[PDB]
Design a protein around this motif. Structure first.
Motif, mmCIF file in Angstrom:
data_model
loop_
_atom_site.group_PDB
_atom_site.id
_atom_site.type_symbol
_atom_site.label_atom_id
_atom_site.label_comp_id
_atom_site.label_asym_id
_atom_site.label_seq_id
_atom_site.Cartn_x
_atom_site.Cartn_y
_atom_site.Cartn_z
ATOM 1 N N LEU A 1 -53.950 -79.706 28.827
ATOM 2 C CA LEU A 1 -55.294 -79.515 28.342
ATOM 3 C C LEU A 1 -55.328 -78.252 27.473
ATOM 4 O O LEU A 1 -54.727 -77.236 27.855
ATOM 5 C CB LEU A 1 -56.221 -79.337 29.558
ATOM 6 N N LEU A 2 -56.010 -78.310 26.324
ATOM 7 C CA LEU A 2 -56.226 -77.125 25.476
ATOM 8 C C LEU A 2 -57.688 -76.620 25.590
ATOM 9 O O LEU A 2 -58.510 -77.213 26.290
ATOM 10 C CB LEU A 2 -55.879 -77.440 24.009
ATOM 11 N N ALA A 3 -58.005 -75.517 24.925
ATOM 12 C CA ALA A 3 -59.388 -75.031 24.887
ATOM 13 C C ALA A 3 -60.302 -76.135 24.294
ATOM 14 O O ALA A 3 -59.960 -76.782 23.288
ATOM 15 C CB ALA A 3 -59.467 -73.790 24.060
ATOM 16 N N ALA A 4 -61.447 -76.350 24.932
ATOM 17 C CA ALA A 4 -62.464 -77.305 24.455
ATOM 18 C C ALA A 4 -63.122 -76.923 23.130
ATOM 19 O O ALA A 4 -63.247 -75.740 22.819
ATOM 20 C CB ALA A 4 -63.529 -77.437 25.524
ATOM 21 N N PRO A 5 -63.561 -77.930 22.340
ATOM 22 C CA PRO A 5 -64.486 -77.645 21.241
ATOM 23 C C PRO A 5 -65.728 -76.989 21.831
ATOM 24 O O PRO A 5 -66.047 -77.194 23.000
ATOM 25 C CB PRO A 5 -64.869 -79.033 20.706
ATOM 26 N N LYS A 6 -66.398 -76.178 21.033
ATOM 27 C CA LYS A 6 -67.725 -75.651 21.401
ATOM 28 C C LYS A 6 -68.830 -76.726 21.293
ATOM 29 O O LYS A 6 -68.726 -77.610 20.445
ATOM 30 C CB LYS A 6 -68.060 -74.530 20.434
ATOM 31 N N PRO A 7 -69.884 -76.647 22.133
ATOM 32 C CA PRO A 7 -71.006 -77.577 21.984
ATOM 33 C C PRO A 7 -71.629 -77.392 20.608
ATOM 34 O O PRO A 7 -71.608 -76.287 20.052
ATOM 35 C CB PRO A 7 -72.010 -77.117 23.058
ATOM 36 N N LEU A 8 -72.160 -78.474 20.051
ATOM 37 C CA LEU A 8 -72.794 -78.445 18.758
ATOM 38 C C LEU A 8 -74.120 -77.693 18.899
ATOM 39 O O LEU A 8 -74.804 -77.831 19.919
ATOM 40 C CB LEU A 8 -72.975 -79.883 18.266
ATOM 41 N N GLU A 9 -74.479 -76.885 17.900
ATOM 42 C CA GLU A 9 -75.752 -76.189 17.889
ATOM 43 C C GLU A 9 -76.982 -77.108 17.689
ATOM 44 O O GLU A 9 -78.032 -76.902 18.309
ATOM 45 C CB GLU A 9 -75.764 -75.136 16.773
ATOM 46 N N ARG A 10 -76.871 -78.047 16.736
ATOM 47 C CA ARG A 10 -77.888 -79.071 16.513
ATOM 48 C C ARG A 10 -77.847 -80.082 17.663
ATOM 49 O O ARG A 10 -76.773 -80.616 18.041
ATOM 50 C CB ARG A 10 -77.607 -79.787 15.183
ATOM 51 N N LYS A 11 -79.023 -80.315 18.220
ATOM 52 C CA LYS A 11 -79.169 -81.134 19.405
ATOM 53 C C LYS A 11 -80.409 -82.016 19.275
ATOM 54 O O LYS A 11 -81.505 -81.555 18.828
ATOM 55 C CB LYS A 11 -79.377 -80.242 20.628
ATOM 56 N N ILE A 12 -80.233 -83.271 19.674
ATOM 57 C CA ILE A 12 -81.295 -84.259 19.625
ATOM 58 C C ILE A 12 -81.409 -84.911 20.995
ATOM 59 O O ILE A 12 -80.378 -85.209 21.626
ATOM 60 C CB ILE A 12 -80.990 -85.409 18.596
ATOM 61 N N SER B 1 -73.348 -90.757 27.278
ATOM 62 C CA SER B 1 -72.741 -89.597 27.982
ATOM 63 C C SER B 1 -71.276 -89.598 27.545
ATOM 64 O O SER B 1 -70.622 -90.646 27.535
ATOM 65 C CB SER B 1 -72.737 -89.800 29.528
ATOM 66 N N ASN B 2 -70.728 -88.435 27.212
ATOM 67 C CA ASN B 2 -69.355 -88.458 26.723
ATOM 68 C C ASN B 2 -68.624 -87.178 27.077
ATOM 69 O O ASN B 2 -69.244 -86.119 27.222
ATOM 70 C CB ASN B 2 -69.313 -88.773 25.208
ATOM 71 N N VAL B 3 -67.306 -87.302 27.241
ATOM 72 C CA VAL B 3 -66.434 -86.199 27.599
ATOM 73 C C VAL B 3 -65.571 -85.925 26.373
ATOM 74 O O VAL B 3 -65.010 -86.872 25.786
ATOM 75 C CB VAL B 3 -65.536 -86.583 28.795
ATOM 76 N N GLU B 4 -65.516 -84.646 25.980
ATOM 77 C CA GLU B 4 -64.846 -84.227 24.742
ATOM 78 C C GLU B 4 -63.842 -83.100 25.016
ATOM 79 O O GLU B 4 -64.151 -82.095 25.704
ATOM 80 C CB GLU B 4 -65.892 -83.809 23.715
ATOM 81 N N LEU B 5 -62.616 -83.271 24.533
ATOM 82 C CA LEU B 5 -61.573 -82.292 24.880
ATOM 83 C C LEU B 5 -60.473 -82.301 23.823
ATOM 84 O O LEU B 5 -60.380 -83.233 23.001
ATOM 85 C CB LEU B 5 -61.020 -82.511 26.310
ATOM 86 N N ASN B 6 -59.685 -81.237 23.851
ATOM 87 C CA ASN B 6 -58.441 -81.159 23.095
ATOM 88 C C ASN B 6 -57.299 -81.111 24.072
ATOM 89 O O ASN B 6 -57.404 -80.472 25.148
ATOM 90 C CB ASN B 6 -58.424 -79.896 22.219
ATOM 91 N N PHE B 7 -56.199 -81.787 23.714
ATOM 92 C CA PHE B 7 -55.003 -81.785 24.517
ATOM 93 C C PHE B 7 -53.769 -81.712 23.628
ATOM 94 O O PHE B 7 -53.779 -82.132 22.466
ATOM 95 C CB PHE B 7 -54.943 -83.008 25.446
ATOM 96 N N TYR B 8 -52.703 -81.184 24.196
ATOM 97 C CA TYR B 8 -51.401 -81.137 23.500
ATOM 98 C C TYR B 8 -50.520 -82.242 24.112
ATOM 99 O O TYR B 8 -50.461 -82.383 25.320
ATOM 100 C CB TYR B 8 -50.754 -79.729 23.677
ATOM 101 N N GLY B 9 -49.863 -83.063 23.291
ATOM 102 C CA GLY B 9 -48.894 -84.035 23.838
ATOM 103 C C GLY B 9 -48.950 -85.328 23.019
ATOM 104 O O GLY B 9 -49.275 -85.290 21.834
ATOM 105 N N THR B 10 -48.659 -86.461 23.648
ATOM 106 C CA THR B 10 -48.616 -87.724 22.891
ATOM 107 C C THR B 10 -49.488 -88.809 23.514
ATOM 108 O O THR B 10 -49.638 -89.904 22.943
ATOM 109 C CB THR B 10 -47.196 -88.268 22.911
#
Ligand SMILES: OC[C@H]1O[C@@H](O[C@H]2[C@H](O)[C@@H](O)[C@H](O[C@H]3[C@H](O)[C@@H](O)[C@H](O[C@H]4[C@H](O)[C@@H](O)[C@H](O[C@H]5[C@H](O)[C@@H](O)[C@H](O)O[C@@H]5CO)O[C@@H]4CO)O[C@@H]3CO)O[C@@H]2CO)[C@H](O)[C@@H](O)[C@@H]1O
Length: 327
Positions: A107-118, A25-34
């Motif tokens: 916090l920035l806009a998230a990546p989109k979920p991947l289309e390929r899924k397993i 299980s994983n949390v994925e995000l984009n952020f601005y900063g250091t």
């Protein structure tokens, strides 16, 4: 605009934060900063790793407590990509993510979920139990269960696919390791949170690929009855097929079975695949991971080392590419 991507089976019922349990299980995000920090509540000894701009960072634990951890810092000021990965399996406890903090950043806009899924369905092998252990006589250590380097996770990254890892160490189709009482795979498979009874909505994630690696526990001590084993396996396939009528289903054997347990399990799974195929369902396949032979070492309690996981991933990536035409 800003948001977070939750990759896996997550429960959002508590507004205080999303909850999860399954390996990987994983949390994925984009952020601005250091820098970036997170607060996690964990029911047991769970281990995590942050991967930041493609760099994996030293793993850390949150053990039967709530902790705030600074995941990364000292970065060049700018936009950064973060994956926060639950290394450890469901039996080591549920996890709730209670918020991220970016210091002066945001916090920035998230990546989109991947289309390929397993979706993976399996046992200790899929959990990557002991993959960072260094010899077969070593006992289980939560810190050494690195599902980010499971054959499953590696294959998903090879294919640029997401994966849900529905797996539980010691679990079987007809019995658990050494005849241990308790739920079997079909019992746990319908859950988001297998300890707290939250059921998964299967319509939320429909994979093109399902990888099943079960049966080691059905043949590692006592040998499961053929009819009982074949029937359990076909029942699992039926359930998968019910939720994902179009998935390509890979039925896998190896690499921990040996001797007659391996001969029987191979024969039975082959028969299950052959039966489905003759029934008109041509999108059910057999895969065998050659028995491990010591040349890439062993992890805890004989479970595959990272090197063996990487071989498995090489093979499974090729099998998926062949059948789906991916890449
Ligand atoms: O997260 C905790 C979780 O634990 C679960 O239970 C664990 C259990 O605690 C472990 O002890 C158990 O470990 C065993 C492996 O499952 C099993 O595969 C392995 O089998 C070995 C066997 O012991 C060994 O003799 C055998 O040797 C053959 C060689 O492989 C061949 O090359 C050679 O030719 O022949 C010899 C036979 O002479 O190898 C196999 C492996 O191939 O034995 C381990 C014990 O020593 O694993 C469980 C999980 O997978 C528990 O159920 C969960 O509830 C709990 O939460």
């Amino acid at each position: 605009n800003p948001g977070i991507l939750y990759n896996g089976r997550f429960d959002f019922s508590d507004p205080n934060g999303p909850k999860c349990a399954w390996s990987g299980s994983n949390v994925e995000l984009n952020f601005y900063g250091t820098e970036a920090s997170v607060t996690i509540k964990s029911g047991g000894e769970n281990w995590f790793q942050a991967i930041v701009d493609g760099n994996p960072l030293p793993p850390f634990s949150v053990n039967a407590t709530t902790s705030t951890v600074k995941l990364v810092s000292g970065l060049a000021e700018g936009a950064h990509h973060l994956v926060l990965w639950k290394r450890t399996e469901a039996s080591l406890g549920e996890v709730q993510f209670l918020g991220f903090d970016f210091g002066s950043g945001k916090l920035l806009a998230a990546p989109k979920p991947l289309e390929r899924k397993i979706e993976f369905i399996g046992d200790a092998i899929t959990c990557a139990y002991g993959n960072e252990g260094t010899s077969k006589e070593q006992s289980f250590t939560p810190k050494n269960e690195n599902s980010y380097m499971s054959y499953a996770a590696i294959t998903a990254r090879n294919l640029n696919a997401s994966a849900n890892m529905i797996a539980w160490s010691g679990i079987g189709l007809t019995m658990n390791y050494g005849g241990a009482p308790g739920p079997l795979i079909m019992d746990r498979y319908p859950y988001t949170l297998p300890y707290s009874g939250v059921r998964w909505d299967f319509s939320k994630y429909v994979p093109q690929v399902v990888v099943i690696n079960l049966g080691t526990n059905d043949f590692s001590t006592s040998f499961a009855d053929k009819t009982k084993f074949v029937t359990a396996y076909k029942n699992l396939i039926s359930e998968v097929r019910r939720n994902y009528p179009d998935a390509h289903i890979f039925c896998c054997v190896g690499p921990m079975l040996w001797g007659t347990g391996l001969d029987l399990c191979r024969s039975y799974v082959t028969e299950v695949v052959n039966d489905c195929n003759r029934s008109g369902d041509l999108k059910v396949y057999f895969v065998e991971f050659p028995q491990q032979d010591g040349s890439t070492g062993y992890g805890e309690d004989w479970h595959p080392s990272i090197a063996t996981h990487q071989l498995m991933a090489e093979r499974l990536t090729a099998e998926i590419k062949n059948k789906l035409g991916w890449l």
